[PDB]
C-alpha cells in the first residue's frame, strides 16, 4: 500500500490556525496519546521549517481521545475530497427505519499519507503558561478528521464491505469522515445483530470499533410552527398570532393574514378580550394545515452551503432550522444540564441529521459569545468531526415564532 498523491489547488496555502489554550489534564492526555502515535509511527516530530498548524483537542467515557480541527485544511482540500475522490450520498439513508453510527477512524492509521502532503497536517500540543515551545508533530498516516482520509480509503472500504453489502443489499452503508452510517428497515434485534456482524467484518482488516444506540430517520418530521388553540383571545394574543403568520408567509406559499387584521380595528387595550370571527377561524385552520406540511418550493441545492440556526427557548428547550437560502427551511426541529452542554448536544444532534439527510454538515449560527463557546465546547463534545460555526445574536422575535 503506497500513497495517493494529494493536492491543494494552485492558489491557496496550508492551514495556519492558532492552537486554543487547553487545560492541563487535556495537555497531559494529549502527550501520552502523541507519544504512542510517534512510537507506533503514525506521527513524527517536526521542526520550525513547517509553517502550518491545525488545532488539536482532547475529548471522551473515561478514555481520553485526540481530536484535530481540520476545518481549514478540509476547506482548502475541497477539490480533492469532493470532486476528485468524492463519496456520493445515498438518498435512501434518511428513509431507513434505524441507523447506527460506527467509528471507523482506526482504519486510516494503516494507510500511509502522501509524503508531500504531510507538512499540511502539522499540529501543536501547547505548554501551560508557555513554559515550553510546545510539542510539534505531523501525520505519516491518514489522519482522522481530515476529509481526504475516507476519500482515499473508500477503495479499501468498498472491499471490506463488499461481502456484507452483497449479503445484505437492502442495508445502506455510508462513509462520512470517520463514521460509517449503517441503515436498515430490519427490526431492532435484527438490526443490532446485523451491526454486530458488520463489526466482525471490520474487526478483520483491523478495526475494533442527542443520540441513543441508533438513530431513527423515518420518524424525523418538521416541528410545525405552533399556532395556539386558545379558549379566549386578547388583542395581544392576536397581535402575537399575526406576527407569527406574517413572517410565516415569507416562508410558506399561501399563508393568509387578512381576516385577523380586521379584528385589530382601531387602538385597543392589549389586555382586551375580543370575539373570534368566522373567516378568521377559517384562515387560522387553513394556515395550521400548511405549517404541518413541508415548505413547497424549497429544495436542497448541492452547490450551496447548508446553514443551521438555533434558538434557546428556556427550560432545556432548543429550536433549530436548516436552510440554504435565508428562511427557506429544508428542516426544522427541537431538542430537550447547563447552557453550553445543551447547545453542544444540540449542534451534534443537528449535524448528525444533516449528514444523514444531505451528506454535508451545516455552518451553525450559534446564540452565544465566541469565547464562552470556544472555552467550553470541547468539554461535552463527543463527535469525531467539527462543523463550521459563527456567533450570532438571536433576534428575540424569531425565538418566539418557533414556540
Minimum separation from the CB atom of position 143 to another protein (A): 18
Contact 36/73 with Cβ under 8 angstroms? no
Coil, strand or helix at 335 = strand
- Can residue 169 be called a binding residue for another protein (CB under 8 A)? no
CB of 30 to another protein, least distance (A): 12
Nearest approach in angstroms of CB 242 to another protein is 7
Closer residue to another protein (CB): 67 or 235? 235
In sequence order, what are the beta bridge partners of 102?
180
Q: What would the grid cell of residue 82 be?
A: 469532493
Using CB under 8 A, pick the residue from 8, 17, 33, 50 that binds another protein: 50
- Is residue 18 at the binding interface for another protein, with CB under 8 A as the rule? yes
C-alpha 195: how far from chain center = 23
Residue 128 binding another protein, by CB under 8 A: yes
The reply to whether 231 sits in an annotated binding site is: no
Sheet strands side by side (includes 123-125): 43-45, 135-139, 123-125
Judged by CB under 8 A, does residue 269 bind another protein?
Answer: yes
The reply, when asked if residue 103 is annotated as ligand binding, is: yes
Which residue among 149, 342, 348, 378 contacts another protein (CB under 8 A)? 342
Report the alpha-carbon distance of residue 352 to residue 361 in Å, rounded: 8
Distance CA 227, CA 403 (A): 9
Place of cell 510546545: 134
User: What is the DSSP track for 136-186?
Assistant: EEEESBPPTT-THHHHHHHHHHHHHHHHHHHH-TTSEEEEETTEEEEEE-S
Residue of 267, 289, 297, 299 that binds another protein (CB under 8 A): 267
Buried b (16+ CB within 10 A) or exposed e, 71-94: bbbbebbeebbeeebebebbeebb
Angle between helices 370-380 and 339-358 (to 10 degrees): 80
Should residue 403 be labelled a site residue for another protein when binding is judged by CB under 8 A?
no
188 vs 392 by CB, closer to another protein:
392
Residue among 132 and 158 whose Cβ is closer to another protein:
132
**Site membership for another protein, residue 3 (CB under 8 A):** no
| Residue span binding another protein (CB under 8 A) among the ranges 16-24, 29-37, 72-80, 208-216 | 16-24
CB of 362 to another protein, least distance (A): 18
Interface residue with another protein, options 76, 256, 288, 312 (CB under 8 A): 312
Backbone angles phi, psi at 285, to 5 degrees: -70, -30
Residue 130 within binding range of another protein, rule CB under 8 A: yes
Q: Restricting to residues 225-244, which ones interact with another protein according to CB under 8 A? A: 234-236, 239-240, 242-243
Round to whole Å and give the CA distance between 358 and 88.
Answer: 10
The correct pick among 8, 17, 27, 227 for binding another protein (CB under 8 A) is 27
Q: Is 111 in the site for another protein (CB under 8 A)?
A: no
Per the annotation, binding residues are 103, 178-179
Per the annotation, binding residues for Mg(2+) are 103, 178-179
Amino acid at each position: 500500500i503506497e500513497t495517493v498523491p494529494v493536492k491543494l489547488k494552485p492558489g491557496m496555502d496550508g492551514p495556519k490556525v492558532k492552537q486554543w489554550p487547553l487545560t492541563e489534564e487535556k495537555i497531559k492526555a494529549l502527550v501520552e496519546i502523541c507519544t504512542e502515535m510517534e512510537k507506533e509511527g503514525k506521527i513524527s516530530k517536526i521542526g520550525p521549517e513547517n509553517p502550518y498548524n491545525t488545532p488539536v483537542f482532547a475529548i471522551k467515557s473515561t478514555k481520553w481521545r485526540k481530536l484535530v480541527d481540520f476545518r481549514e485544511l478540509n476547506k482548502r482540500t475541497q477539490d480533492f475530497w469532493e470532486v476528485q475522490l468524492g463519496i456520493p450520498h445515498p438518498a435512501g439513508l434518511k428513509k431507513k427505519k434505524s441507523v447506527t453510527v460506527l467509528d471507523v477512524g482506526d482504519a486510516y492509521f494503516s494507510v500511509p499519507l502522501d509524503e508531500d502532503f504531510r507538512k499540511y497536517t502539522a499540529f501543536t500540543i501547547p505548554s501551560i503558561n508557555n513554559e515550553t515551545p510546545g510539542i510539534r508533530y505531523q501525520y505519516n498516516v491518514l489522519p482522522q478528521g481530515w476529509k481526504g482520509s475516507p476519500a482515499i480509503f473508500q477503495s479499501s472500504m468498498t472491499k471490506i464491505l463488499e461481502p456484507f453489502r452483497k449479503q445484505n443489499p437492502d442495508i445502506v452503508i455510508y462513509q462520512y469522515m470517520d463514521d460509517l452510517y449503517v441503515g436498515s428497515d430490519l427490526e431492532i434485534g435484527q438490526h443490532r445483530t446485523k451491526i454486530e456482524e458488520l463489526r466482525q467484518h471490520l474487526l478483520r482488516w483491523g478495526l475494533t470499533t442527542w443520540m441513543g444506540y441508533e438513530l431513527h430517520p423515518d420518524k424525523w418530521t418538521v416541528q410545525p410552527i405552533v399556532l395556539p388553540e386558545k379558549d379566549s383571545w386578547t388583542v395581544n394574543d392576536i397581535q402575537k398570532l399575526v406576527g407569527k403568520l406574517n413572517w410565516a408567509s415569507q416562508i410558506y406559499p399561501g399563508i393568509k393574514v387578512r381576516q385577523l387584521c380586521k379584528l385589530l380595528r382601531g387602538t385597543k387595550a392589549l389586555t382586551e378580550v375580543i370575539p373570534l370571527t368566522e373567516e378568521a377561524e377559517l384562515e387560522l385552520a387553513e394556515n395550521r394545515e400548511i405549517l404541518k406540511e413541508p415548505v413547497h418550493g424549497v429544495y436542497y441545492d448541492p452547490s450551496k452551503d447548508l446553514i443551521a440556526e438555533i434558538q434557546k427557548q428556556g427550560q432545556g428547550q432548543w429550536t433549530y432550522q436548516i436552510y440554504q437560502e435565508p428562511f427557506k427551511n429544508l428542516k426544522t426541529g427541537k431538542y430537550a444540564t447547563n447552557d453550553v452542554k445543551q447547545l453542544t448536544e444540540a449542534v451534534q444532534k443537528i449535524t448528525t441529521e444533516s449528514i444523514v439527510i444531505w451528506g454535508k454538515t451545516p455552518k451553525f449560527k450559534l446564540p452565544i459569545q465566541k469565547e464562552t463557546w470556544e472555552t467550553w465546547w470541547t468539554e461535552y463534545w463527543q463527535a469525531t468531526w467539527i462543523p463550521e460555526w459563527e456567533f450570532v445574536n438571536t433576534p428575540p422575535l424569531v425565538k418566539l415564532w418557533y414556540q
